[PDB]
Amino acid sequence: MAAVCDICGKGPGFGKSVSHSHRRTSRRWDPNIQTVHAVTRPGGNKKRLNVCTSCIKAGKITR
Amino acid sequence: MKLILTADVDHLGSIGDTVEVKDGYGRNFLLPRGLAIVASRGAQKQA
RNA sequence: GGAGCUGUCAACCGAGCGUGGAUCCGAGGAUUUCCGAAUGGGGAAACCCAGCACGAGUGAUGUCGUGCUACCCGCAUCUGAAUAUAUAGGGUGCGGGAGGGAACGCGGGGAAGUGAAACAUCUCAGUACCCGUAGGAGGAGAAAACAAUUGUGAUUCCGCAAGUAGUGGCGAGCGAACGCGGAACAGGCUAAACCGCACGCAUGGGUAACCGGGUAGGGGUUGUGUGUGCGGGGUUGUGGG
RNA sequence: UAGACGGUGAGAGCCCGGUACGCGAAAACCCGGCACCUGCCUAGUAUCAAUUCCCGAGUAGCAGCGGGCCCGUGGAAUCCGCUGUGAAUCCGCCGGGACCACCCGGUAAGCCUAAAUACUCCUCGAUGACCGAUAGCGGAUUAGUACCGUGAGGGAAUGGU
RNA sequence: GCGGAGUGAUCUACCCAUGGCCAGGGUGAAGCGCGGGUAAGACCGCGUGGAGGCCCGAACCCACUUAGGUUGAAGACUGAGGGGAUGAGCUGUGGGUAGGGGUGAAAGGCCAAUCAAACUCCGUGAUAGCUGGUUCUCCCCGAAAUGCAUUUAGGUGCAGC
RNA sequence: CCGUACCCGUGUGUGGGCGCCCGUGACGAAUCAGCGGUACUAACCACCCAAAACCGGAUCGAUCACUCCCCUUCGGGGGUG
RNA sequence: UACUAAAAACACAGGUCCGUGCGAAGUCGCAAGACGAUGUAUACGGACUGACGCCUGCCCGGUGCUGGAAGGUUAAGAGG
RNA sequence: UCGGUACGGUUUGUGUAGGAUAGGUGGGAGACUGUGAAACCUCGACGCCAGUUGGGGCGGAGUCGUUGUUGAAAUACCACUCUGAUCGUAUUGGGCAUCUAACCUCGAACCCUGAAUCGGGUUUAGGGACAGUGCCUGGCGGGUAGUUUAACUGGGGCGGU
RNA sequence: GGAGCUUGACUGCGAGACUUACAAGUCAAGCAGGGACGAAAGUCGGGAUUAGUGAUCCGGCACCCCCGAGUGGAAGGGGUG
Helix, strand or coil, X not given: CCCCCCCCCCCCEEEECCCCCCCCXXXXXXXXXXXXXXXXXXXXXXXXXXXXXXXXXXXXXXC | CCEEECCXXXXXXXXXXXXXXXXXXXXXXXXXXXXXXXXXXXXXHHC
């Protein structure tokens, strides 16, 4: 799971890979986006949301 | 994490005494169950 | 505007218009089969087939005509299941979008050949190329910038600086900045502390100690605290609110 | 104030269409001006003690991995992105090329900002020590046609009485 | 030849669903019944019946040898002879897998007459120490094929002429 | 096109035949009292396989603590108990 | 092996081994999701051989695999 | 449970002086009347029938510094003795065991789906803070991609330089 | 060949030549300082000579105030060995 954080825009970063011999190739840094059940009130539908840990730290924190 | 504890919990202690939540226990056990709230500005309400 | 027209290609007929203003020029408007974003459904594009409503017509089914009918987003609003609160959904309504365009711009993705007398780092290059995405230009911008003791006082662009200091299997090669001189030269609104209110959560469900401050009194009642929201205020670095 | 070009039977200022120059817009559009309409203010400016609050938060900064800036992780600052941790509001915080004390400068994590600059599908007017039909756009002529190709695509020749 | 972006499974390779074709003969399994056999079985000989990745042999699909053709009648054929021909079959319609990938009863062959990685366009005026070309004249003067070093000996730099 | 069939559909026609509506016929509720069944089933029970601890027997070892004799280079094993 | 080469090459049956305990293994795809399979150890994918008959000898040293933990070596992180 | 950070506490080896065996040294060369009382009885880590320290009871107005035959032995005041071992007050890593509360379940039933075997929601049941995933990091790895693999070579190769 | 004492198997320079494509290599009288042998004159800048070696970049040790990205320091860089 790496798809863009639904409520921030934390997309993947793209770049290279500095090998020991410096033969760089393409790689990307995916954000730690986890699938959580999200509600809008005490006891809501608990739909679904792939969201980053920084939002688990502040924002849409339900469970 | 500093949550205003509103229920007698063995882990944390007496209601309104203190709090040392390990950044997640309260997130998925106190805040969804209605046992504690976020100490945003309620510290004045508690004391 | 004016006496000749009926376009040309290919040029021979026919029959007509015209000084009362034709042909011709330019604008606006109407009409605008069918396909194509094509979008009532569907599709071998230019084909077929439906539904709703109005109306024409046949002695009546058939047929025709004019309108409406995709999706997604957002806005207002009714209902709001499984499941009770309640939401997702569903329903109705009004706007916008959807695809093209010759080049130009931004962000982001991201090569090889070549060169390196081979060649991997590297270079050719963040070009070509795909998507997104605008605009008539855009981007960038109002100093958490430069200088280094004289200070300047938003950004951008051309030219110096310079093929330098520098960086590089110190190889091929790459390549600035400060500062100076020019073009055009504009800087202005918001958040937050606070205050008065609406919504919201607790307390007091009473002695709240508030009701524009205060005085003399009264009622003693919605006081207090706090989340969201509207409107005042405040928007700055010699620090300011 | 017309000798620019072109055409007319051959080399035209005075033959012709035109040029110089001056006129010229109902209506529509664009621009500008005028009036209406819309919309802001019953001041916080100034002197002062400094008790208290505030100046953009999972941000800054730190660590690791990467990008890029002359700067090829190197002693590697500034800037951007990802991942964990994770501060403060003026005796503050960041920068001034590892870094540290002092000094100058500006107060980030919120928004907008025309001109100068670049470009030409297309439409005007003009130019040319540019071409003259095997050249110029491939295309002066039924031209992106005939034709070739499953198709994407490739892609002619023919001017002159 | 390399890279990107696109295009083609309408021939061919494989598969999928769905219809069809296979004249006419030959052989005559199991099963069944009878008789013999055994208490039954095992076993033998008969009749019906009729199966086989069965046989000979047409259409049909192939392409084994030879001859012919070979600027051919044809960018892979013909004639005379052969193999399979009720099956792992053939063939049409319809569809899909598409390029560092597909497919393959496996040959490194087929993928629109080209496959030890298809085609078109773009990068691209690709590059090559290599081959071929490099357009009118005249006048003066006039070499080397030696030496050093070279991921170098068919090239180049410096020296010598 | 002459002649003869078949299918879908509309409207007109005859009379028949059925039903609307009335009428008729057949099933047929509705509550209350009792009583059942256990039907579900709190509990509890029959079976019911599993069974937290605690006790134990063996199992080998490249685990380890102790020991017998055998070896050495000194680091290490045997059948063992 | 169209377009020089049809066989002694290939291929199935048969016989072994390896792997797989279920959105299995393996493959396609980055993932989702498919195939395998509307199957699940008498099944499935993979490797060698290629009916039947008799058989399939010796060798675990090297390199593979499958199991093992004493020690050694042993990144980051922690600590410093 | 193991192993740790900080810290309040009775506090630790018959190796040597010996009523005096704590790595050691000390606001005091006594902590006053202001200490767990040299009585038998009996035994706790050391255990040496010996002790600073003891181990439980007590003839309830004194062990004694100031009665050293030693490092000045009187530290159950101090460095709170290195204070092990340990009694535990906060903190904390790993492993061990369990749970439900995140999370997971092409595990069952139900809902606009009466338009579905996908999805989505609920409930239930079972795994379960593991796994998968993100960052960093080690290993493996011709399955994949890009390159190299010298020369006079008495043609080239082997050879030798 | 042999014996006694020693460390010039040094420092900063070295005109001028050979040789050579270039880099590179090779010799050098004599001078300043300071020292060894020598009573002295004088010899000594390794071995009777020629073979015993390896360009550049980068990195490491010691040393020299050479700089020190505002200043004073440091990191780092620079010079000599």
